[PDB]
Structure formats: structure tokens, C-alpha cells
Write a protein that binds this DNA or RNA. Structure first.
Ligand SMILES: Nc1ccn([C@@H]2C[C@@H](O)[C@H](COP(=O)(O)OP(=O)(O)OP(=O)(O)O)O2)c(=O)n1
Ligand SMILES: [Ca+2]
Ligand SMILES: [Ca+2]
Ligand code: NA
Ligand code: NA
Length: 328
DNA sequence: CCGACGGCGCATCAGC
DNA sequence: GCTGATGCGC
DNA sequence: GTCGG
């Protein structure tokens, strides 16, 4: 990684602003800058050089000059020695504990893994499961395992109803050699933007995956989105595979292209693309792309026949999934 | 200078 | 119970 | 924290 020291520093600052300062726009600012620096194909020699990149301003340029000259940033060294910051940054690593909950636990004297394990009864369901699998959820998933997981999900969904189509998206669809979690986009002809002709379309799939012991726990579940935990079966005498996070999202069949654009990510890519759409006078969500009237009210959905159509509306050349990651 | 920053599903809570 | 805000996550 | 109007 050409500028890994810099992007690491900016990521650490982003996490501080999100988790401790609760300043979401500074978090996004740092992440935007980290991403543009990550794709820059030269080893950066100064802050002024970095300043020419969109998303890098005066303050970040100064931090880059300090980092290049000293290998460190005093602001981060300080943050690293602050007990309250350190504690909040740690607690937020548990799925379900955000900036607010982290600060509340710290105020109650709950600030270590051991404290959390003593106080399960103060956690909501999501948080309890996040704690249970804390170690497992920090492990990455090799692509070879994602392929085994894909097999299972696609075959089990087919057993429920051959009319379902499940597509694995996120970093996997972007060609990543390892993934943080699994994202499954689901469609069925009876669920469209105009009607739902069958109930329990998502439920019956979750149920099948629970029945075969693939899905092990549930963080949250509604009519269109499941967030939970899964695990590959292991063989005789073999150590068990780590538990993995899995997201399943049922999308209207006729809005698949907006859906898959959304579900493919990355997060920064989607934010950047949607911000560009706004500048071009459009709004993109997972369902539709719509024009904005001068009032700033979204108009009627535009025809979409491919992922590329969405890019054409906003006057972007098509980006293949592989070029939608944070690093190139 | 300064308003705006992507957009939304599910869980939880406050007020009626 | 519903409605709307907040937290957290994708 | 950054940037376009
Ligand atoms: N804030 C976010 C987060 C995610 N997304 C979309 C929706 C989601 O499906 C897709 C992937 O998100 P994930 O958080 O799963 O991240 P990746 O798959 O890119 O990377 P990893 O799992 O290997 O760490 O990107 C998004 O619009 N906005
Ligand atoms: Ca993922
Ligand atoms: Ca995910
Ligand atoms: Na810049
Ligand atoms: Na968290």
C-alpha cells in the first residue's frame, strides 16, 4: 500500500470523530479523504501534493506534513492515551454498541470485555450476540469459505422455491480475496414494487437456513431485512469454523438493478455516487433513481434496465464492481 | 463565508 | 396501541 | 473537515 501510513491515520481520526466526538460529518470527511488518498497512484511526498485531491483540505494536509516528517501525529498519540476515548473506541467494536451506548456503559463503569461479560443483563439482544461472537466477528472470511457459504445459501433457497434468486454482493461481488461478512440480495417474482402476492417470503428462507443449522443467531429481522449470524459445517475432529455475520435483504424484483448497485457497495463508493447524483439533480436509493424538481422534491422513478443505466443518468462512465472498493 | 453532507430497515423509547 | 424521534446498522 | 455557490 503506497500511502498506508496516511490512510491508517485518517481512518483512526475518522473512528475517533464517530465514536468519541459523535461528529458524523467529520467521520465522513476523514473517510472520504482516506479513500481518495488510497487510490492515488504515487507515494505522497507532502501535504500540498495531497491537498490537490478532492476531499483533502488544509487541516488534513497539515496532518500529512506532520506524519511524513515524524512518522506520528501528536493528536492521535494524545487520543490513544485518553482512557475515556480508548474505552469508548473499544466498546463500539461490539456489534450493537454505538457511540451513545458506549459512553453510557463507560459512565456506569462498564469498559472492558470482562465488564461486559459480567453484565449481559444490561445488554439488548443485538449487543448480547455481538459480545458472544466478539472474537469471531473480527476475523475475515477467506474467499474459499465465501464460496462454500454461497453454495449453501443458493442451494437452500432453491429448495424453498426455485423462483427465488439469491445474489451474493458486498466485497465478494467486488472480487475481494477475503470478506468481512456475507451480504445476500434476494428476489422473488411475487414481491415487486406494485404488489406483494405472498407473505413470509424472507421468513421462509431464514427458517430453511436455520433448519439446516447454517443460520445460528438473529440480530434483527423484519419483512425485508435480516441481520444475523451463520456458520459453515465442519468435518469430524475438525475445529469449528468461526461464526460469521450475514445480511439478507429482500428487494422488489423489478428494482433489482438499483438494489444490486446499493448492495454491492462499497459504503464510500455509494456515498460518493449518491452525492454526485445530487449534484446532477437526481436522488438514488436502493429502489429507484428519481429526478429532483427545483423545490428539491424527488419526482417519479426513471426507467432502469441495467446497472449501467444508473451511471448514464448521472453522467458517470460505468464502474465495474471491482473498481468500487475503498482501495483499488 | 456558510449551508450541506446518502439513504433507509429494524429496535427501542417517549409522548399521547 | 400509534406516531415520530433516536440509535445502530447496512 | 471539506467544498461549491
Ligand atoms: N454505510 C453503508 C454500508 C454499506 N453499504 C452498502 C450495503 C452493503 O451491502 C454493501 C457492503 O457493505 P459491508 O458493510 O458488508 O462492507 P463490504 O462488503 O464492502 O466489505 P467487507 O464486508 O468485506 O468488510 O455496501 C452502504 O450503502 N452504506
Ligand atoms: Ca460485506
Ligand atoms: Ca454486510
Ligand atoms: Na483538495
Ligand atoms: Na458497534
Amino acid at each position: 500500500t503506497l500511502n498506508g501510513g496516511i490512510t491508517d491515520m485518517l481512518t483512526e481520526l475518522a473512528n475517533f470523530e464517530k465514536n468519541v466526538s459523535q461528529a458524523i460529518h467529520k467521520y465522513n470527511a476523514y473517510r472520504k479523504a482516506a479513500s481518495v488518498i488510497a487510490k492515488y497512484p504515487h507515494k505522497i511526498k507532502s501535504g500540498a501534493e495531497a491537498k490537490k485531491l478532492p476531499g483533502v483540505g488544509t487541516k488534513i494536509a497539515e496532518k500529512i506534513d506532520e506524519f511524513l516528517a515524524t512518522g506520528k501525529l501528536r493528536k492521535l498519540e494524545k487520543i490513544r492515551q485518553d482512557d475515556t476515548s480508548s474505552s469508548i473506541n473499544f466498546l463500539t467494536r461490539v456489534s450493537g454498541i454505538g457511540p451513545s451506548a458506549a459512553r453510557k456503559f463507560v459512565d456506569e463503569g462498564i469498559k472492558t470485555l470482562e465488564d461486559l461479560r459480567k453484565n449481559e443483563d444490561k445488554l439488548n439482544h443485538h449487543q448480547r450476540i455481538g459480545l458472544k461472537y466478539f472474537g469471531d466477528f473480527e476475523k475475515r472470511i477467506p474467499r474459499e469459505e465465501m464460496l462454500q457459504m454461497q453454495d449453501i445459501v443458493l442451494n437452500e433457497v432453491k429448495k424453498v422455491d426455485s423462483e427465488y434468486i439469491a445474489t451474493v454482493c458486498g466485497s465478494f461481488r467486488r472480487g475481494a480475496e477475503s470478506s468481512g461478512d456475507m451480504d445476500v440480495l434476494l428476489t422473488h417474482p411475487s414481491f415487486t414494487s406494485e404488489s406483494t402476492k405472498q407473505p413470509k417470503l424472507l421468513h421462509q428462507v431464514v427458517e430453511q437456513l436455520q433448519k439446516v443449522h447454517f443460520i445460528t443467531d438473529t440480530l434483527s429481522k423484519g419483512e425485508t431485512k435480516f441481520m444475523g449470524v451463520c456458520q459453515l459445517p465442519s468435518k469430524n475432529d475438525e475445529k469449528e469454523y468461526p461464526h460469521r455475520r450475514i445480511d439478507i435483504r429482500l428487494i422488489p424484483k423489478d428494482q433489482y438493478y438499483c438494489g444490486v448497485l446499493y448492495f454491492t457497495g462499497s459504503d464510500i463508493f455509494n456515498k460518493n455516487m449518491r452525492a454526485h447524483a445530487l449534484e446532477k439533480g437526481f436522488t438514488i436509493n436502493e429502489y429507484t433513481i428519481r429526478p429532483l424538481g427545483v423545490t428539491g422534491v424527488a419526482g417519479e422513478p426513471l426507467p432502469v434496465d441495467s446497472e449501467k443505466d444508473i451511471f448514464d443518468y448521472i453522467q458517470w462512465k460505468y464502474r465495474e464492481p471491482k473498481d468500487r472498493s475503498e482501495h483499488h
